[PDB]
Each structure stands twice: as structure tokens, then as C-alpha cells.
Amino acid sequence: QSEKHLEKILNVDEFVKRIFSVIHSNDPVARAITLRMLGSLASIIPERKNAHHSIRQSLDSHDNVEVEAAVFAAANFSAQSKDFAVG
Amino acid sequence: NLREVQCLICCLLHQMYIADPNIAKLVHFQGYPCELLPLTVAGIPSMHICLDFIPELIAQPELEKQIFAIQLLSHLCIQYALPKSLSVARLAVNVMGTLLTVLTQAKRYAFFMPTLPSLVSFCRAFPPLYEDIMSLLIQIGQVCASDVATQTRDIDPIITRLQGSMDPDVQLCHCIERTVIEIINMSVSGI
Amino acid sequence: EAVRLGPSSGLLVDWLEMLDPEVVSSCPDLQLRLLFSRPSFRPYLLTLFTHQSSWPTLHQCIRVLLGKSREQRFDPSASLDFLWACIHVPRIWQGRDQRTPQKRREELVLRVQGPELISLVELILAEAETRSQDGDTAACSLIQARLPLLLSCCCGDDESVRKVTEHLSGCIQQWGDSVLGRRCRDLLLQLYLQRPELRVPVPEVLLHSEGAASSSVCKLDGLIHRFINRGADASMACRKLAVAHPLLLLRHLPMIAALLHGRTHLNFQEFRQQNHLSCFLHVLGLLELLQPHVFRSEHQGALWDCLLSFIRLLLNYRKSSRHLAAFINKFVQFIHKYITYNAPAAISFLQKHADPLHDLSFDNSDLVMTA
Amino acid sequence: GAFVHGLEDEMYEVRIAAVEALCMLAQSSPSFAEKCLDFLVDMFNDEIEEVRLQSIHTMRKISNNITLREDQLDTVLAVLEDSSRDIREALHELLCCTNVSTKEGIHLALVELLKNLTKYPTDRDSIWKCLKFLGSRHPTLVLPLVPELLSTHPFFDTAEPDMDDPAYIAVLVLIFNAAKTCPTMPALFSDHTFRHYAYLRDSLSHLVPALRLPGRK
């Protein structure tokens, strides 16, 4: 909902690290939620490499909710990043 | 169609295990048939935390719980090869040796018949346990051999150094020699 | 199938799936020749049939597809990709932990019969023998791509035996040397498969299952050389693996060609008790054992030439030939290599144009010209 | 006895003139070059940045079919300096065009350059270029290093290393630039190493080359 307030965040790195600390969990629904959060956060983190690696890794996974969230976040990163777009 | 039901049930069990590990501990204390032990370990990632209570499960006075703990640990060591898994594997070898010291013959058969493939799994997972594993085998072999000499037998396996409802002792000796065959052919083709 | 209507056939394709509930319901023959033939809408109906039909119907199709039939009524590309899709349907692996496997462990395969294996391998080689414009390297890439399916459907030693025991006749467009080369991927234990592959004498570029073990053996040999228990194994296992299989050690020859460069540290070799004495004796033992591979064809003599140049440089740096057994053995190996091949003799003459003049020894002059 | 006295007398004028002379007469003479090789490795402690820079140049011009048996230790510890930015980039240009025929030389060069990385996190692009060219120049010498350089423990599972650590990336770009020609190297990786190859190929296409791995066809 609050997408237009995302560019006002100052301490971006701590925010993204705290969000990103859930990709390495083993609950697939939690992982899918965190990739959806990355896709929402796409505007403020266009060129973060570990995010792209997580999207690529979870994109060819076998849990369907993880796959769908990965496609969402790949669509949202692909609108802004270029190396992500070609890979 | 069986595999689809199996993987769906594995998904639900993984969700229920990550919801609360106490259910996983209670279920593995209760036990399930060993033919599910591959499927439950290969398919549910959460069984990694199952390596937390194998020392506790192997310490229970009940015996079939100890066979279940040994078999579950073996399949976990096949799946996850970690220093934690190797340490609990060494503990398992020590527990099997101690129970070899303390077991009645009928209970010795009932304990050592379903375990011995787990020793193949332990040896396949970790090279540094080989000789330790080997030591246990040679010990169990000769103690079973001594039991064969205690009473008359219908097959006389002692003089069969060349290659149904039988005596339990010759069945245990045959299980020991077959698990040695499996270990050797695993080692030869293991590159 | 018959009318070649351009756009409207797509609607017909829709109407097919719009009114036929499965993919195969009532008329199997026309539908099977529709999906597999000697079109443009084929991939959509085929990925349907991958994800549409019931499992008994899929097994019926998998037995009738790879069945015994000399008519070749099925396209190999569509059929093999249908196989590879049926191996990895996402409904089969719907919740298993992904991309943390054990390479030693094999999780699951698909079981087929012996004649099924024979039919599948002749179908994949019939695919490999097309070669309209692809070339040999594209053939190798294709059979590399289709090889893990063969390893999946076999999954054993005796089916490995029954596939390696079948070698066809003919001399042109054979392409049976490909499977006789990827028996290394199959990791066979018999020298009979190595004998036909050595008779073929083709270059090896694919990875082998036993390559890591031989790499560890070469590293153990280097560690035994640099040490002066594990040295005994490093001395035994390398020679045993070389005599067991020559193609593997021929492939690993560049890896061991970079070794044995510690001769310049102790030119007199008095300080080096075994750092510059045991390693050269071991590698000359390997070469005198694999003399049949030393006289091999082209694209392999560069490593042997480098080894010979290193041996000549070590001989020139010796303490006026204090040890004559190793020098005599090296001269015997060089004489055998020169007698075996003319190209190796020319390379040895090119080296000895500078090496034998610097040597000027009795054995060098001798090698320069029972019961 | 000219060059045995022609160097160690005066300021950069005499030294640079003499070493440009040995540049041209190592270019003209295919022989002799081991002698100019070991008459350049001594003159590293001349306390002149210009002499160091033009010395890196005078041996990078003559680096053709020349190997370094014992004189490679000083030329890799010469990087150890406070800033030396032009000297450092010249040294990375030297290291990517040199030729060497030993294994322990590769081991010491890699550990010293990783120590350079851990002391100066500033020039990761330059070292990625020189390690790429070092892998491309000679692939064969680093085959036994891969079982030793990275964690490849036989039975313990190899943990996935830090992707964003820009030091594992350098040894990967070495490995996969040296993996283009030799066939006995895909069998020696692990699953995480193929996924790292996938991301390095898709991200840094100008560093790692395309391989024939089954994972990325």
C-alpha cells in the first residue's frame, strides 16, 4: 500500500538486511512472502546482487508458492534492472 | 499416483513440523514403519532438526525405539552429511557396542537384525568410521559364531567358508556376512 | 493432420483440447501419429500430454513409444523430450528440497526393460546419425544433453553391461564410439569396453566419473614426492589404475605433466633424498607401462613432448650421471618411443639437436645414433 | 663487463637508458633473455618510483617464452607498499602477461594477491582482469590447486560461500578462465560451484567465459 513512501527511507541497508534475513529460512511460505516483499521494495534496491541471486535460485524451485512469488519479484526487478533483465 | 500423494503429505508434514518441533519429536519417539524412512527424510527438509534428539531417542530404555533411532540416524546421515551427523554416528556406534556388551541372545537377535543395514549407511556416509564400523562387525560376527557353537544346528555354517524358517543364530550370521558383502561392494563401486 | 491451413489450424488445435477430455481418449493411432511423425502445433499438444493424461495412459504411451518397431514412426526429438519431461514432472517432486543433493546418492529413476533400453538407445543414435547440418560437435553436444536420460533409465551395472556389449557394424557414420567414450561417465570396471574404445582411438573431451579419484591419486603422488604410509598407496594405485584403464591416464597426462619440476632445487640430488629421485622413477614407470598410449595419435603428444623435455632438462642438470639406472631407463623409454612413432622420433631429434650436444656422454652417444 | 657496471651508479637517467637497451636487445635476440631476466630481478630496491614503474615496463615488454623458476618471490612481494597506485596497476599488468612453469609459484602468487585484496579493497576490477588473463594464459598449472585452494572436503558437505565477498569471485574467475580448455575440471566442482558459475556468467559476462557445463547449456 505505502509504495510512494518507500523512497523516503534513510537507513536503507539495515532495512533490506532485516528483510533479507528470511530468505535463508526453510519455510517456503515465509520465503515466498519475503520474495514478494523484495518485489515490492524493487524501487529502492534495483542493483542489489544477492536479491537477484535469490530470485534466480527460488525461481526454479519446486514449491509452487515460491515459484509464483519468484515470478512476481522477477517481473518487478526486470522493470528497473538491466543485468537482471538479460540473465 | 502414489508419489503425488506422498509428496503432498510430505509438504503438509513439513509445514506442521516447522509449526512446532515438539510434534516432530513426539512422532519420532512414537515411531513409524521403516519403509517410510527414505520418503520421510528425502522430502521433508525439517528432519534436519531431527538430529537434535537422536542422542535423547537412543538413550530411552525401550529397545525398538533404539532400532528406530539407529535407522533414522542412518537415513539422515545419508541425506545430511554434517559434523553433527558424524558425531551422532560415532555415538551410535558406541551405543551399539555397549548394547553388544549388554544383551540377551533373543534380544540380541531382535536388536541386531533390523539395524545392520544402517551400518552400511553409516559407512557410506563417512569414510573415517570404516575401521570402527569394521571392528563392530568382526566382534558381532564372532560372538554370533560362538552362539552357533552353543547348540546343534540344521545348516552348520561354521564349515561354510567357501561362498525360510531357520535358527535365529544362523540368520544373524547370514545377515552379518551379507552386510559385509554390501559394505565391500559399496566400497569397490564407490570410486 | 492432413489439411495445411495456416492460422485456422490453431483454432482446430483449441477445438481438439476443447472437446477431447484427455489427450488420448478414443482414437489412439491417429492421435499418436499426430503427436509423433517422421508440425508447428506439436509442442503445445505435447506439453499438454505431458501434463494432461492419466498415469496408466502415460505408461501405455511410454511402452508403445519405445517399443520394438523398425518403421521409425516416431520423431526422436519429440519422443526423447517427452521422456525427459516425464522424468521431471513438477507433480512428482512437488515439495522436495531443491539444489542441495548428494552427488554420490541417486534419488529416483524410471524403470524400463531390457528391450526398452535397446530401443531407446537405437532411437537416440538414430537421432545422432541425422547430421544434416549440425556437425560432429553439435552431435556431441546433443548426445551429452541426452546422456543423463540414458543414465537415469539404466541405473545399474548389468544393464550397463548389456548396453556396452552392443556394437554395430559398418565403418562410416558409426557414432557408436560416443557411448564407448561415455562409458567413463558410466564408470565401468571392465577392460573389454576399454579395448573397443582404444581400437576406436578418438579424442576424449567429456568428464569422467573416475576423474576425481585419479586427480586425488596424482595429488597423492605429488605429496609423496614432496614428503621426502600414504606414499605406498600413491605408488601402487596410480600404476594399477594406469594398467586397468589407459584412456583415463591418457586424459590425466597434462595434469601430471605440470609436476616433477623440483629437479632444479637439488641439481646434485644429495640434499633431496626423494624429492627429485622417487618421482622421476615413478613417472618413468608410468610411461614404460603406458608405452602403448605413448605412441598414440595426434592432439596428445604435446604432454609427452613436455615430459620428455623435462626429463632431458633433469638429465642435463644431474651430477655428472651419478645414478645411471634412471638415465638408462630414460634412454630405453626414449628408444622405444622413437621406434614406435616417426613423429615422436622427429620431436626427439629436434630436442636432441641441443640436448645430446650438451650431454656428450657414453650412453648419450650410444642412444644418439633370457631363458 | 658493461651491464654489470652499467646499472648501479647514478640516478634514473643511466638506469632507464641501460634497461631500455636491454629491452630492445632482448626483443632482437630470442636467446640471452634469462640473463636479462635475472639482471632485472635484483634491481627492485632502487627507492625510485620511476625506476620501479619503468622496470615493470622493461620486463613486461620482454615477457615472451620466459618462465620464473626462483625469481618470482621478489616480484610478488614488491607489491607490498603503502599506496603505489601506478606501481600497483603496472604490477597487475605484469602479472597477467608473465609466464611461469611451477605450481607453488601459482600458490604463492594467489595467496599474496589475496593478501593485497584484504589490505586494499580498492582495485578488485584490476585484479579480476589480471586473474582472468592469468587463467587464460596457462590453464594447466592450476589443476592440482583446485583440490587445495577451495573447501572440497570429501565427506563433509561444503557450505555455500559468501557470494558478495569480492575475494571468492577472483578465485572463481581464475578457475573458470582456466576451465575453458582442460576437460578434467567439470568433474571436480560441487553443486554450489555450478550455481555460482551460472550467476557469474549471467552477471559478469566479461570476466568468466562460456563453458560446456551441463548446468548452463
UniProtKB/Swiss-Prot annotation, chain A:
Coiled-coil regions listed in the entry: none
Location of the protein in the cell: Nucleus; Chromosome; Cytoplasm
Disulfide bonds: none
Superkingdom assignment: Eukaryota
Subunit and partners: Component of the Integrator complex, composed of core subunits INTS1, INTS2, INTS3, INTS4, INTS5, INTS6, INTS7, INTS8, INTS9/RC74, INTS10, INTS11/CPSF3L, INTS12, INTS13, INTS14 and INTS15. The core complex associates with protein phosphatase 2A subunits PPP2CA and PPP2R1A, to form the Integrator-PP2A (INTAC) complex. Interacts with NABP2.
Family of this protein: Belongs to the Integrator subunit 7 family.
General function of this protein: Component of the integrator complex, a multiprotein complex that terminates RNA polymerase II (Pol II) transcription in the promoter-proximal region of genes.
Listed name of the protein: Integrator complex subunit 7
From Swiss-Prot, chain B:
Cell compartments where the protein resides: Nucleus; Nucleus membrane; Cytoplasm
Family, similarity comment: Belongs to the Integrator subunit 2 family.
Role summary: Component of the integrator complex, a multiprotein complex that terminates RNA polymerase II (Pol II) transcription in the promoter-proximal region of genes.
Subunit and interaction comment: Component of the Integrator complex, composed of core subunits INTS1, INTS2, INTS3, INTS4, INTS5, INTS6, INTS7, INTS8, INTS9/RC74, INTS10, INTS11/CPSF3L, INTS12, INTS13, INTS14 and INTS15. The core complex associates with protein phosphatase 2A subunits PPP2CA and PPP2R1A, to form the Integrator-PP2A (INTAC) complex.
Protein name: Integrator complex subunit 2
Curated annotation (Swiss-Prot), chain C:
Superkingdom of origin: Eukaryota
Outcome of substituting residue 246 to L: In NDCAGF; uncertain significance
Annotated compartments: Nucleus; Nucleus membrane
Record's function text: Component of the integrator complex, a multiprotein complex that terminates RNA polymerase II (Pol II) transcription in the promoter-proximal region of genes.
Subunit structure and binding partners: Component of the Integrator complex, composed of core subunits INTS1, INTS2, INTS3, INTS4, INTS5, INTS6, INTS7, INTS8, INTS9/RC74, INTS10, INTS11/CPSF3L, INTS12, INTS13, INTS14 and INTS15. The core complex associates with protein phosphatase 2A subunits PPP2CA and PPP2R1A, to form the Integrator-PP2A (INTAC) complex. Interacts with ESRRB, ESRRB is not a core component of the Integrator complex and this association is a bridge for the interaction with the multiprotein complex Integrator; attracts the transcriptional machinery.
Disease connection: Neurodevelopmental disorder with cataracts, poor growth, and dysmorphic facies: An autosomal recessive neurodevelopmental disorder characterized by severe global developmental delay with motor impairment, cognitive delays, absent or severely limited speech, dysmorphic features, hypotonia and cataracts.
Family the entry assigns: Belongs to the Integrator subunit 1 family.
Protein name as annotated: Integrator complex subunit 1
Residues of the full protein shown: 1607 to 2044 of 2190
From Swiss-Prot, chain D:
Subunit (UniProt): Component of the Integrator complex, composed of core subunits INTS1, INTS2, INTS3, INTS4, INTS5, INTS6, INTS7, INTS8, INTS9/RC74, INTS10, INTS11/CPSF3L, INTS12, INTS13, INTS14 and INTS15. The core complex associates with protein phosphatase 2A subunits PPP2CA and PPP2R1A, to form the Integrator-PP2A (INTAC) complex. INTS4 is part of the RNA endonuclease subcomplex, composed of INTS4, INTS9, INTS11 and inositol hexakisphosphate (InsP6). Interacts with BRAT1; interaction is required for the assembly of the RNA endonuclease subcomplex.
Chain's role: Component of the integrator complex, a multiprotein complex that terminates RNA polymerase II (Pol II) transcription in the promoter-proximal region of genes.
UniProt repeat feature HEAT, residue ranges: 1-29, 30-68, 70-108
Organism classification: Eukaryota, Metazoa, Chordata, Craniata, Vertebrata
Family membership: Belongs to the Integrator subunit 4 family.
Compartments, record wording: Nucleus; Cytoplasm
Name used for this protein in its record: Integrator complex subunit 4
